[PDB]
Write an enzyme that holds these catalytic residues in place. Structure first.
Site, PDB file in Angstrom:
ATOM      1  N   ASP A 194       8.585  -0.505   1.384  1.00 34.64           N
ATOM      2  CA  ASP A 194       7.246  -1.028   1.118  1.00 34.64           C
ATOM      3  C   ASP A 194       6.390  -1.275   2.356  1.00 34.64           C
ATOM      4  O   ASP A 194       6.804  -2.010   3.254  1.00 34.64           O
ATOM      5  CB  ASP A 194       7.331  -2.355   0.366  1.00 34.64           C
ATOM      6  CG  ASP A 194       7.794  -2.200  -1.066  1.00 34.64           C
ATOM      7  OD1 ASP A 194       7.775  -1.062  -1.601  1.00 34.64           O
ATOM      8  OD2 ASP A 194       8.168  -3.241  -1.655  1.00 34.64           O
ATOM      9  N   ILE A 195       5.199  -0.679   2.401  1.00 32.43           N
ATOM     10  CA  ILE A 195       4.273  -0.906   3.510  1.00 32.43           C
ATOM     11  C   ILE A 195       3.124  -1.756   2.985  1.00 32.43           C
ATOM     12  O   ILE A 195       2.587  -1.511   1.908  1.00 32.43           O
ATOM     13  CB  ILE A 195       3.596   0.371   4.060  1.00 32.43           C
ATOM     14  CG1 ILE A 195       4.595   1.522   4.211  1.00 32.43           C
ATOM     15  CG2 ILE A 195       2.924   0.033   5.377  1.00 32.43           C
ATOM     16  CD1 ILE A 195       5.698   1.272   5.204  1.00 32.43           C
ATOM     17  N   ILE A 204       0.762  -1.213   0.000  1.00 32.59           N
ATOM     18  CA  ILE A 204       0.000   0.000   0.000  1.00 32.59           C
ATOM     19  C   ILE A 204       0.814   1.296   0.000  1.00 32.59           C
ATOM     20  O   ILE A 204       0.242   2.372  -0.021  1.00 32.59           O
ATOM     21  CB  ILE A 204      -1.098  -0.068   1.142  1.00 32.59           C
ATOM     22  CG1 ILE A 204      -0.673   0.631   2.424  1.00 32.59           C
ATOM     23  CG2 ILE A 204      -1.232  -1.471   1.625  1.00 32.59           C
ATOM     24  CD1 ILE A 204      -1.669   0.378   3.589  1.00 32.59           C
ATOM     25  N   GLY A 205       2.141   1.190  -0.037  1.00 31.29           N
ATOM     26  CA  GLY A 205       2.980   2.376  -0.054  1.00 31.29           C
ATOM     27  C   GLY A 205       4.485   2.178  -0.250  1.00 31.29           C
ATOM     28  O   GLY A 205       4.993   1.050  -0.265  1.00 31.29           O
ATOM     29  N   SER A 206       5.197   3.298  -0.374  1.00 31.25           N
ATOM     30  CA  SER A 206       6.644   3.343  -0.567  1.00 31.25           C
ATOM     31  C   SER A 206       7.056   4.766  -0.230  1.00 31.25           C
ATOM     32  O   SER A 206       6.200   5.656  -0.194  1.00 31.25           O
ATOM     33  CB  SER A 206       7.008   3.057  -2.023  1.00 31.25           C
ATOM     34  OG  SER A 206       7.127   1.671  -2.292  1.00 31.25           O
ATOM     35  N   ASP A 239      15.067  15.793   9.115  1.00 31.18           N
ATOM     36  CA  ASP A 239      14.516  15.568   7.798  1.00 31.18           C
ATOM     37  C   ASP A 239      13.033  15.895   7.774  1.00 31.18           C
ATOM     38  O   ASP A 239      12.207  15.107   7.329  1.00 31.18           O
ATOM     39  CB  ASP A 239      14.754  14.135   7.342  1.00 31.18           C
ATOM     40  CG  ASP A 239      14.606  13.986   5.838  1.00 31.18           C
ATOM     41  OD1 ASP A 239      14.721  15.021   5.145  1.00 31.18           O
ATOM     42  OD2 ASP A 239      14.385  12.849   5.364  1.00 31.18           O
ATOM     43  N   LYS A 283       5.445  -3.453   8.083  1.00 30.29           N
ATOM     44  CA  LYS A 283       6.684  -3.388   7.321  1.00 30.29           C
ATOM     45  C   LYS A 283       7.433  -4.685   7.553  1.00 30.29           C
ATOM     46  O   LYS A 283       7.327  -5.281   8.618  1.00 30.29           O
ATOM     47  CB  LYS A 283       7.589  -2.243   7.763  1.00 30.29           C
ATOM     48  CG  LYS A 283       7.020  -0.854   7.643  1.00 30.29           C
ATOM     49  CD  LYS A 283       8.127   0.116   7.251  1.00 30.29           C
ATOM     50  CE  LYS A 283       8.029   1.441   7.998  1.00 30.29           C
ATOM     51  NZ  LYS A 283       9.393   1.926   8.392  1.00 30.29           N
TER      52      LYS A 283
END
Length: 290
Positions: free
Chosen positions: A18-19, A15-17, A124, A34
C-alpha cells in the site's frame, strides 16, 4: 488523529498497491509514502530503501525523501510517481503504437543498464515495475521494486558470480527468459531478454504463452516454459519490425557473463524510430484522445 511523519509530511489517502499520498505541511507539494509494521513477517521496506539509497543519482530511480520510524511503523517517503506502464497499457486498451514502444524501449534499456552498472540485475522486468514521472519528469520512465534484485559482480573486482543451475523460477513467469525457465542463475542478459518480451507484449496486447491452462504453479510454469521454447522468435515477432527479432536474438545469444552491447540495442531501435519519421516529442499513446 491526523498523522504527520518526519516532521515535514502529512499522511494522506491510500493511492496504490500500500502506497499513501502525502504532502509537505508547508508547501503542499505531494509525495508518496510507504509504511511497514515493525512486526511484519515479510519486511521489504529496508532493502528497497537501501536500493533507492544506493541507486540514488541515477536517472529514472525514485528519489528517497526520508527514512525513519514513527511509532511502530517504519516509514519511507519518496518522490511521487506516475502510473505504471501496465496501467497505461490498460488505459490504451492493451495495445501500444510502434512509436510508443520505441520511446519506451529506448529508456527502459538505459534503466536496466544503469542497474547493471551498479552490480545488480533486476530479475523482474515487467510493465508493472516501470512508472512514468510527474511534471518535469513526466516524460521519464522510472524503474522500481528491487525485492528480487541481486548482486552479479564484485563491487571492486567485477568478478561475475558463478554460473549455476537447478535455480528456482524467480520473477514473473510470463516475462522470464528461456534460461531462467531452465533453472540457470540469472545475469544481465536475462533482464534484457525479459524487456524483449515486455516490448513484444506491448506490440501484440499479449504473449502466446499467456493465459495458459494449468493445474499447478509447477504445471503452469512448465507449460509456459515449453510454450516459450516452441515459439521461435521470427514467428513471435512476425508482423512487426525485424528490429524486435534482432533484439531478442541478440539477447538470447549473450554468454552467461557477457556484457550486453547496450548501445547496439538502443541504436537498433533508434534507427527504426527515425526510418518511420517519428519525433522524440514524448507524445505517448496515453497522451492522446481515446
Amino acid at each position: 488523529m491526523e498523522l504527520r511523519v518526519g516532521n515535514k509530511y502529512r499522511l494522506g489517502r491510500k493511492i496504490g498497491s500500500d502506497i499513501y499520498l502525502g504532502a509537505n505541511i508547508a508547501s503542499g507539494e505531494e509525495v508518496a509514502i510507504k509504511l511497514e509494521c515493525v512486526k511484519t513477517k515479510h519486511p521489504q521496506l529496508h532493502i528497497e530503501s537501501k536500493f533507492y539509497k544506493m541507486m540514488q543519482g541515477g536517472v529514472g530511480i525514485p528519489s528517497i525523501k526520508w527514512c525513519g520510524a514513527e511509532g511502530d511503523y517504519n516509514v519511507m517517503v519518496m518522490e511521487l510517481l506516475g502510473p505504471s506502464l501496465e496501467d497505461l497499457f490498460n488505459f490504451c486498451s492493451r495495445k501500444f503504437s510502434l512509436k510508443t514502444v520505441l520511446l519506451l524501449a529506448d529508456q527502459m534499456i538505459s534503466r536496466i543498464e544503469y542497474i547493471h552498472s551498479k552490480n545488480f540485475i533486476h530479475r523482474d522486468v515487467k510493465p508493472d515495475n516501470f512508472l512514468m514521472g510527474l511534471g518535469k519528469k513526466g516524460n521519464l520512465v522510472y524503474i522500481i521494486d528491487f525485492g528480487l534484485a541481486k548482486k552479479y559482480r564484485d563491487a571492486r573486482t567485477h568478478q561475475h558470480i558463478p554460473y549455476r543451475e537447478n535455480k528456482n523460477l524467480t520473477g514473473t513467469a510470463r516475462y522470464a527468459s528461456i534460461n531462467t525457465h531452465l533453472g540457470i542463475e540469472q545475469s544481465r542478459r536475462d533482464d534484457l531478454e525479459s524487456l524483449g518480451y515486455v516490448l513484444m507484449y506491448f506490440n501484440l496486447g499479449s504473449l502466446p504463452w499467456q493465459g495458459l491452462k494449468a493445474a499447478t504453479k509447477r504445471q503452469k510454469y512448465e507449460r509456459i516454459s515449453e510454450k516459450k521454447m516452441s515459439t521461435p522468435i521470427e514467428v513471435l515477432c512476425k508482423g512487426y519490425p525485424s528490429e524486435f527479432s534482432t533484439y531478442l536474438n541478440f539477447c538470447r545469444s549473450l554468454r552467461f557473463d557477457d556484457k550486453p552491447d547496450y548501445s547496439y540495442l538502443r541504436q537498433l531501435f533508434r534507427n527504426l524510430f527515425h526510418r518511420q519519421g517519428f519525433s522524440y516529442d514524448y507524445v505517448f499513446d496515453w497522451n492522446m484522445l481515446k
